[PDB]
Amino acid sequence: GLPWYRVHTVVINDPGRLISVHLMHTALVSGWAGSMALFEISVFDPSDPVLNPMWRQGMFVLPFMTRLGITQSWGGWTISGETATNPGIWSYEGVAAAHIILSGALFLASVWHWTYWDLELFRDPRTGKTALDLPKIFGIHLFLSGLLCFGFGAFHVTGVFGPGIWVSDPYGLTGRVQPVAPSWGADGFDPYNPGGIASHHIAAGILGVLAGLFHLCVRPSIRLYFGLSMGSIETVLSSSIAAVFWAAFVVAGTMWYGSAATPIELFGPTRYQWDQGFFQQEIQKRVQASLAEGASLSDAWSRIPEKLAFYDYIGNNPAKGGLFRTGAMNSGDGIAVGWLGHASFKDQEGRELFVRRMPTFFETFPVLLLDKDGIVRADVPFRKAESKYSIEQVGVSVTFYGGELDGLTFTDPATVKKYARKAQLGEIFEFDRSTLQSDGVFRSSPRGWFTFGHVCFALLFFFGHIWHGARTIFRDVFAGIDDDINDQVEFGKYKKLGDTSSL
Amino acid sequence: ARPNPNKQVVELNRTSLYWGLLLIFVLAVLFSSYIFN
Amino acid sequence: EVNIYGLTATALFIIIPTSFLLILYVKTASTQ
């Protein structure tokens, strides 16, 4: 009578049925892929990729198809905004339907092996038992993986026969899909170089083919054979779970810290750009470069793209989320409708009183007004009794530059405090808190949720690896000690713990 | 007699399994449009 | 407006007699 948590141990020694459940698992994963692709198409809005990107909508598996070059649907719309004529076989819906067809085909393939599991491949032809030759199987699989890795790196990445991958402007304005020149020097290890990703798989697949043929030819030592119990099968599971959760921290770290694999035009920004002050420094440099020419404020500030000013906003920082704040950044606080422009806060003299930006940890940071040096000259007081630096007492006006409300000025404190509490967040955008019924609190991003899943599952696979690494080695004492543990548990008499080399 | 002399066993074969599941899904397919309205 | 009550009614009318029939089938095919 088996317990409920070991019911899959009836296929430790039935390899056709093992292949059947491998196939059924693969079919279920492909079924999720197709269904999530179709659901995400049906939810997706292509209406304006300038202010409503993919990552504001909570879109998840479409910025992987767009990452590897699927940039067109059967509706005729594309990602960058224009329309393309020929969709071909491979559109988004075609990729989804192809995965559904794979799901059905692997289902019908999964039925056949468990219906007919008792063939003569799974039979040791020498003596007549049911074994399988694991180093040669590993050589075959490593050879296949090397072939597919080399082909992917040579053809599909570099645009030899494939269409290429998304390689973008680092400042996030003009990204597109491109064939990549593989670089072989020292710049191939800089992860912001897609030539490194191109030149990676070329070497990786070749070395995998070499190692795979090596394991097809040679055979291991008896020393390592008994040291790793290669006749057992579950050592492969214990090693594979280890390799998988080593991969998981890598794909979580590159997703979180940002690389060439995760473009900001497909995932939004990262949190480190905020407290490094990336977009603000770039905007102020590209403003002062135009103001040093002789241009004025209202035509200097009005040359910055909205897709540049949109990343200078704390609502797109993916570290202001929440665990049970479900949904997407549109349902967070609205849809990006307008950009009001840059705002300046001037005292009774003409000094540009700056507004201290909000840090990451602080949910409700209070409103201060810095000078050019760092001395606080005004505030929004939490307590209203003996306020000395209030905007009502000082008389700070606000002037706009660029944006929708260009060329405007306000002095009324009920409006100045509103725009101060809103300019605390970064740049000023007018939203739609009425259509999708938002609540005005911020959400997270597909850069965030991917990281959460792939660190939690990594940490769980750590424990699964420890468990199978224990249970592989301790197979003989799996269900209890023997009746005759000797008197070798003494302290000092037996001068060696059980080993019989020199006692 | 303190143990029950009428403990009896229910029995439901695979044919009746398929009939019951097909009945439940056909009832669902029919009434679902009128429920969602 | 869609019946948010109605989708729960649909899911319940699916899952409850399905589980009721599966219990009896597994109890039956356990013995034979």
């Binding site: - | 074969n13 044919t15 398929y18 599941l21 097909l22 899904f25 969602f36 | 869609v2 989708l7």
Partner: peptide
């Protein structure tokens, strides 16, 4: 939203048809 419920119900009916055809008990002799 409800279109997915409709499609799920139709596909589930077809799946029960499939399992009823192929994974039945064999009608056995004497």
């Amino acid at each position: 939203m409800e279109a997915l419920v409709y499609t799920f119900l139709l596909v589930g009916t077809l799946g029960i048809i499939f399992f009823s055809i192929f994974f039945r008990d064999p009608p056995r002799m004497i």
